[PDB]
Amino acid sequence: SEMSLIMLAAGNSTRFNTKVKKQFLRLGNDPLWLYATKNLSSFYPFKKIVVTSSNITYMKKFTKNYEFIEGGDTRAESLKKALELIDSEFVMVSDVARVLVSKNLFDRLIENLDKADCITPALKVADTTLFDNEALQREKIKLIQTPQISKTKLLKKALDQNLEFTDDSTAIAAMGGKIWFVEGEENARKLTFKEDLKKLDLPTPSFEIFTGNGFDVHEFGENRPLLLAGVQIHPTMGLKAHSDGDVLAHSLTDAILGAAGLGDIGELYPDTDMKFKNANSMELLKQAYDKVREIGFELINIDICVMAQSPKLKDFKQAMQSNIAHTLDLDEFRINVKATTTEKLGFIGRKEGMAVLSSVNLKYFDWTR
Amino acid sequence: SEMSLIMLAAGNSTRFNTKVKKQFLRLGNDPLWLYATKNLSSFYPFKKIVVTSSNITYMKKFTKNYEFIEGGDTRAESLKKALELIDSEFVMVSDVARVLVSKNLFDRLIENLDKADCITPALKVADTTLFDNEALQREKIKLIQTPQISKTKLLKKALDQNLEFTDDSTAIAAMGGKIWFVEGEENARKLTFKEDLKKLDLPTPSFEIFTGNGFDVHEFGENRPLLLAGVQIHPTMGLKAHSDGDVLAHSLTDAILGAAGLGDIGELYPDTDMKFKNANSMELLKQAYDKVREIGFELINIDICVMAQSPKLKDFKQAMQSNIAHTLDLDEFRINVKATTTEKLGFIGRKEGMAVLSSVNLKYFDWTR
Amino acid sequence: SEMSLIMLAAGNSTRFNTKVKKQFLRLGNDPLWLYATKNLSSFYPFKKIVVTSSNITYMKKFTKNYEFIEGGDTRAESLKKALELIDSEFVMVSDVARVLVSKNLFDRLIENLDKADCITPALKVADTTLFDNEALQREKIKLIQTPQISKTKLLKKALDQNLEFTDDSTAIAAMGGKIWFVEGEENARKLTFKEDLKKLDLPTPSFEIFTGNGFDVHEFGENRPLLLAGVQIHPTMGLKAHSDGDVLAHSLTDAILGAAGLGDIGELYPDTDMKFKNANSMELLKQAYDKVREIGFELINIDICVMAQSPKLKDFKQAMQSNIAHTLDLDEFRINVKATTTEKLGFIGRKEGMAVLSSVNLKYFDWTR
Amino acid sequence: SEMSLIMLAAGNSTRFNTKVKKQFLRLGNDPLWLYATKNLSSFYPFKKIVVTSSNITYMKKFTKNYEFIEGGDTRAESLKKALELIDSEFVMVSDVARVLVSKNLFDRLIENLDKADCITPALKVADTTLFDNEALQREKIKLIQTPQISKTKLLKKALDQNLEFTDDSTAIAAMGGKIWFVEGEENARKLTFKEDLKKLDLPTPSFEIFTGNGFDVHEFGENRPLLLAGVQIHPTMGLKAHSDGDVLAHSLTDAILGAAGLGDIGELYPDTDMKFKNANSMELLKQAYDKVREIGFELINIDICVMAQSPKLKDFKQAMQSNIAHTLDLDEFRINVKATTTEKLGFIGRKEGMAVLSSVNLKYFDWTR
Ligand SMILES: Nc1ccn([C@@H]2O[C@H](COP(=O)(O)O)[C@@H](O)[C@H]2O)c(=O)n1
Ligand SMILES: Nc1ccn([C@@H]2O[C@H](COP(=O)(O)O)[C@@H](O)[C@H]2O)c(=O)n1
Ligand SMILES: Nc1ccn([C@@H]2O[C@H](COP(=O)(O)O)[C@@H](O)[C@H]2O)c(=O)n1
Ligand SMILES: Nc1ccn([C@@H]2O[C@H](COP(=O)(O)O)[C@@H](O)[C@H]2O)c(=O)n1
Ligand SMILES: Nc1ccn([C@@H]2O[C@H](COP(=O)(O)O)[C@@H](O)[C@H]2O)c(=O)n1
Ligand SMILES: Nc1ccn([C@@H]2O[C@H](COP(=O)(O)O)[C@@H](O)[C@H]2O)c(=O)n1
Ligand SMILES: Nc1ccn([C@@H]2O[C@H](COP(=O)(O)O)[C@@H](O)[C@H]2O)c(=O)n1
Ligand SMILES: Nc1ccn([C@@H]2O[C@H](COP(=O)(O)O)[C@@H](O)[C@H]2O)c(=O)n1
Ligand SMILES: CC(C)=CCC/C(C)=C/COP(=O)(O)OP(=O)(O)O
Ligand SMILES: [Mg+2]
Ligand SMILES: [Mg+2]
Ligand SMILES: [Mg+2]
Ligand SMILES: [Mg+2]
Description:
This is part of a larger assembly, with 4 copies of chain A.
Chain A: E1 3-8, E2 26-27, E3 30-31, H1 32-41, E4 49-53, H2 56-60, E5 67-70, H3 75-83, E6 90-95, H4 103-110, E7 118-123, E8 129-131, E9 134-136, E10 141-144, E11 148-151, H5 152-158, H6 168-173, E12 179-183, E13 209-223, E14 226-228, E15 231-234, E16 237-239, H7 247-259, H8 265-268, H9 281-294, E17 297-307, H10 317-328, E18 335-340, H11 346-349, E19 353-364
Parallel strand pairs in A: 1-4, 1-6, 4-5, 7-12, 17-18
Antiparallel strand pairs in A: 2-3, 6-11, 7-10, 7-11, 8-9, 13-16, 13-19, 14-15, 17-19
Helix pairs in contact in A: 7-9
Catalytic activity (chains A, B, C, D): 2-C-methyl-D-erythritol 4-phosphate + CTP + H(+) = 4-CDP-2-C-methyl-D-erythritol + diphosphate; 4-CDP-2-C-methyl-D-erythritol 2-phosphate = 2-C-methyl-D-erythritol 2,4-cyclic diphosphate + CMP
Pfam families (chains A, B, C, D): IspD, YgbB
GO molecular function (chains A, B, C, D): 2-C-methyl-D-erythritol 2,4-cyclodiphosphate synthase activity; 2-C-methyl-D-erythritol 4-phosphate cytidylyltransferase activity; metal ion binding
């Protein structure tokens, strides 16, 4: 009979993590989770394809071809929830972090479908093996891999109570089910540690570059320091409300989120109830960039235009640039701040307020390092 | 004596066409027609170089080295018109779609200049050949290629009345002229079908990325639905005139045309006579992007800033993004819509109107697929 | 004992120079001077690293790891000044233009440290050698290279009066010091002539692209020609002050400087004393782009939005584009000028002034040519 | 203080084995054991280099740079015997089957020399791990690698009685010694299974081809079947002694052994005591080729000249060729048998005996497959 596919792509491991989540590393044009799913999907006409996710909203923006379901607290819980979507006799289950699974291994699992309740790849070990620094008999060791094929009904039953299983074979085996072991492959290794990247022949990120714009206006008339990019410009010529009033930081935040497709500052820091009154805007900026780095992006450069009749920003431009660099952990040369008056024209010219235009270019994080 | 060059680059075949015209596929930094012309031009100090074109204005922006002439209804008509520019004894004529013509083939044609009235490459065929599904004697078949060298005066005379000839050899032969056949080459194949691309070793497009900006202002005070990116925001708080009043769609159209070097919305859809009063702005947007795709470009991403005191766009941002994606046949994650008020300042703050800032990044279409 | 490093990177030779300074050619992500310094620095735990520079402000934006010092009028003067920073027994000195110095050559110099006062690589010559077109005995010729290691105290003394020495070995030798010659290498060649590039296996520039924005406002009400991008739009509807009043050229200048991290127009052409009253703004634009080319950047494209109620720019857009292209020595297709009114809203709508928004994309100059 | 090196290269595992022993696979020009030893030897000026071996005579023919010692029944026994050759404070020990150990890993072990009694690389495991098909906690697993550095005196003591240890860390630890674990590397993997080859980036065998000659003479005058290449030529015109009298098979055996540097038939099958009287010569041939395959060689072709006045071999040549092919598991086209008389001249011409000249070309076994 027929087979469905569950791709396990939820949870957030710190084991690997730089600031970037491993599921959003770019392989060619595709985020890793999509690359892995596309790969396995190409092997077989699955009845249904399910992806477990901790970021459904974001992932849905990348395809219309799969069913997404919110992950659970463990692999086995994400799996159990996704199984309720499956009604085919068989289900293939795979870690997304096993990216380069070959058609060959797939065929080897498929050709053995009727031999057992669960079919899984495995590798032997020829190294001395220590458990808790004490020697084990290495010949009796199996390292288990994925994809794994199971009878759907049995795997469902297998996960009725125990959600601790790290794979499907131990789950099925613990209820008396039979396992068929198939030889595994180095291409089915699981990306877990930062050091695993160079052990795999992964496609490097595409060269696409994303543009962001930011525009913001604050009003003059608050008796407090004027802070722009966290730098004091004037002791008393402050702007009203919006935390510490840093229109620059706010405009720049919008550009960075915009280039990454992550909305705007009001969606990230909803300030309608005056919740952010005491916020440091440069910290808000830093946290917004953290969000952008999590999904696999990196800044190339920043260019800014401050529109203000007064005060003159000339003596502060290098310091603003340097503070932005430090906040975002960027080299200083990548930041530029400009200014113009409006020749005493309009609301800006009347000194009623000031505006800031920001432009940003983002590329994909180069995990090649 | 001396030789001129006519590059035949007019007409618009649907035989190949995706949305992109084959003459504007990027090979390195150069559009295909320019790459092919540069290639042949490098072989010989031609007295004159003529290019027939259906897009003279656009092509002229790429070089000052050639004479351009408007094409005709057929190859032979474009050729006939271009010949009126030639006064040298000999003329080399070539399809631009034959991109990788070697110096070797050129020399082989040149060394045989005095043997006949027209010198042309040709290939034999060893496959079974059917004409209308009936077998022909394959040994008697010649597949003709280009470049072809002819005595100018004879080719002019050859095209006096009959404009149906698909090459120069049949034209010259039909008036009793003699043809010299030279062995052809796989590198002189004509790009005709989408499938031909992988049969040629063409240079892949450069990684250059083009920026576009768009800014537009519409006035409040029309009692109709507020439509932004084709999405209804408010039932009555509409903007005046400009079709359905979609300032967003209009700003975005400007950014896309701007990045492609194609002017602005008023040049593409002149609306001075109220001609577009009933237009769907999102359809106008789609058609503008079609123009950009025709000349070899593709969108990477879109970022937008709506400047409006009211209404609040928060609940509509995902829908606007999704409608832009659907209209432009782009993945949703590549679109971002932001908003800000101006703190009740200026014409925007007074609710007299609203403005939209758009940014776009365009790359060259990757015909590699 | 211990060793410091002096990288010699000051002065501006026209011997090589296109418009680009050789120290700012991009090798991967790094400017050449930084690439060379990083390379040598990786060979040894130097006590101190000094770089002589004619652009300290700019270079400091790229790293915090080195000490920078202003160069002198000659190599030997830059060296002498940098030596006052060194207190270790030994100093390695190297031309930055010798980019690909191998770890191998380094070891060969280090292993011979105690043999003499100065250790230097050298190559023999097997070609016929002419001095002033008269033959010399080629077997007696040495071509000297860098890095060179010297006893710090001796090299200091060596440069007490004579600042004409082109290397450290002749300096040390002229005071009776001993030189140890070590075999050199083709990888230690000095980039001097444009033709040297293809003789070295240098890493090609990265594909990063930098965004720039420009926004400027001028006021109406001066009875003079309206010049935009150096093109006369109107005989009398001029803008006030700012040289010839070309807001477009001024906005575009800001975008180009901004993308390159070079400040804004007021920092480059301070006009507070009415110094630029008679300037041609398009010449100012050209000179600003020259600055950007000096540090290794090149324009991909320009997109512009003119915000003006009047006059209509339609009939002038192609001419503006063409004049910008000619001024910047760019192909015409890379320039686009758009326009919009503000529906009679705000200061622009009242015809009190006009504004110009510019966007630019810059890439690294491709010295591969 | 100082360090010696022990390369462990004895024993004959069938785990990997085709007919070829893994220590004699060719990597470039070098057998694997020599390639691995050369690699590690290049990292450090070891006081002494010891190689344990089951083929000392053969290995000694490849270098004069190492001390060879006969292996024992286990890794630990070979190690224990080799240690009696070491008097330096430290000893590095390594499996030869870990071929591509990097200089990097070496440095990491060396920099930690004083931290413990034994320094070893190790890798963590992120796969589900079964011991006897039951799940273990994968986080507590270490896979141990080589090289391993130990204090010589302690490792000697560690191996006083127990010769079962599969590595040096468990040996040292079992006597209360301390272990320092250093991160391992995929390049230090141990070639164990045929499938491991494609997991390593090993240098492919050189293209050297080895010539062999064989010449043999048997005497006529025995009343028995004439067998040549195991094929009956004549029912009664037999040759005297030498097993079944097959001079052809005997000559060919000499050529194959000769090309491989393995002596001659009398050294392999000493027949002075009439021990081989009942042998099948084609089986002896097959076994001689097995020896040649064990050391990494493979036949390209065989050419033979039989010198015999009678009988005529014409009708038997294809059958002889085919029987040689079957015996040696070679494609038939690679075998050729020729014949000539001597015009009734000499001992052959008098029909006193017959001679066989053989030529063979051997290449290195292409383990790439
Ligand atoms: N709560 C979780 C945890 C992990 N997973 C997925 O299960 C796979 C295996 O993860 P571990 O190696 O962390 O067990 C990963 O692909 C991970 O994304 C999940 O879907 N839900
Ligand atoms: N017309 C508008 C204006 C603002 N907004 C939202 O409200 C937030 C706060 O707006 P101000 O910056 O104008 O205070 C913005 O970041 C944006 O999320 C909106 O959705 N629609
Ligand atoms: N009206 C036309 C049609 C084709 N051509 C050119 O003639 C060449 C041959 O086109 P066909 O293969 O479509 O005949 C092409 O390079 C095409 O661009 C032209 O210059 N004018
Ligand atoms: N100053 C101006 C303003 C508008 N225009 C043109 O007029 C068109 C319509 O302008 P509005 O969008 O302001 O209605 C623009 O798209 C542009 O082509 C111009 O050429 N010069
Ligand atoms: N005044 C100068 C001149 C050259 N130099 C440096 O000295 C090195 C050798 O330059 P010449 O080949 O021009 O002598 C170059 O790396 C150059 O940058 C310097 O530091 N100060
Ligand atoms: N608020 C401001 C406005 C202008 N400036 C500087 O003054 C210069 C001239 O300003 P105008 O273009 O507004 O005349 C700008 O190029 C910028 O260098 C500034 O430093 N701070
Ligand atoms: N009796 C033995 C067995 C193995 N060895 C060597 O020890 C190393 C490890 O072998 P095992 O993986 O078989 O334990 C191999 O390099 C092998 O050649 C040895 O020197 N003497
Ligand atoms: N014992 C022999 C001798 C010769 N021959 C064949 O007879 C041919 C002629 O032999 P002479 O060169 O010895 O005349 C050889 O080329 C070979 O084909 C044979 O088959 N068996
Ligand atoms: C990209 C930019 C900056 C576009 C211009 C939008 C803007 C800030 C208009 C201000 O109106 P106003 O100052 O003319 O209002 P007022 O009627 O008070 O003069
Ligand atoms: Mg200004
Ligand atoms: Mg705001
Ligand atoms: Mg408009
Ligand atoms: Mg003969």
